[PDB]
Amino acid sequence: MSAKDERAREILRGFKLNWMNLRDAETGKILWQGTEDLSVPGVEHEARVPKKILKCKAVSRELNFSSTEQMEKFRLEQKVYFKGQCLEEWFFEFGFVIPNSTNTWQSLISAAPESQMMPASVLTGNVIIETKFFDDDLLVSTSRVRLFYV
Numbered sequence: 001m002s003a004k005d006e007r008a009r010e011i012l013r014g015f016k017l018n019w020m021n022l023r024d025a026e027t028g029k030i031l032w033q034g035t036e037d038l039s040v041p042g043v044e045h046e047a048r049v050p051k052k053i054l055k056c057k058a059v060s061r062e063l064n065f066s067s068t069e070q071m072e073k074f075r076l077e078q079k080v081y082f083k084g085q086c087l088e089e090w091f092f093e094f095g096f097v098i099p100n101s102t103n104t105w106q107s108l109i110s111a112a113p114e115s116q117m118m119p120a121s122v123l124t125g126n127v128i129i130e131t132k133f134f135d136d137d138l139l140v141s142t143s144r145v146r147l148f149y150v
């Protein structure tokens with residue numbers, strides 16, 4: 001139990017994801033929206049998204065979160081897993097977070113252009129999104145969401 005460990009736990013303790021949405025980056029239409037805290041580690045969350053998301057060249061994410069703790073460089077690493085294999089990875093950087101703030105973070109998620117999507121029916125229930133929450137190099141948490149394409 002190091003000092004860094006204790007700090008990671010403190011951040012996790014003060015962190016909350018309050019809401020999120022996903023929109024087609026071309027049309028701006030809403031594909032998903034929710035208030036479930038999908039960041040909570042240690043349980044498999046489940047979400048249903050319309051299969052048309054798989055035709056989007058990019059997805060626009062809007063994510064609202066609160067943190068009692070100050071963070072120097074809040075960032076995420078996210079991986080798409082299909083039957084346990086990684087098909088795609090993203091890095092997003094929020095940066096500095098004021099202690100006891102609530103913040104809305106906008107991100108653009110690009111589909112890898114050199115891949116071809118498997119169909120929805122094959123993907124559905126077989127895809128896990130693993131999100132790791134970091135402050136700089138400190139791992140705060142790792143959560144998973146299984147996706148159904150509906």
Ligand SMILES: O=C1c2ccccc2N[C@@H](c2ccccc2F)N1CCN1CCC(N2C(=O)c3ccccc3N[C@H]2c2ccccc2F)CC1
Pocket residue numbers: 020022032038039047053054055056057058059061063078080087088109110111117123127129131145147
């Ligand atoms: O389903 C595929 C896919 C399937 C097979 C091969 C590649 C894929 N890549 C992407 C994708 C598909 C189309 C266009 C762009 C894309 F990025 N996707 C869409 C998944 N994508 C990346 C994960 C995104 N995500 C979040 O950003 C997120 C933020 C905080 C906490 C958990 C998160 N997990 C997911 C997420 C967000 C909202 C609802 C469910 C969900 F799982 C939601 C959008």
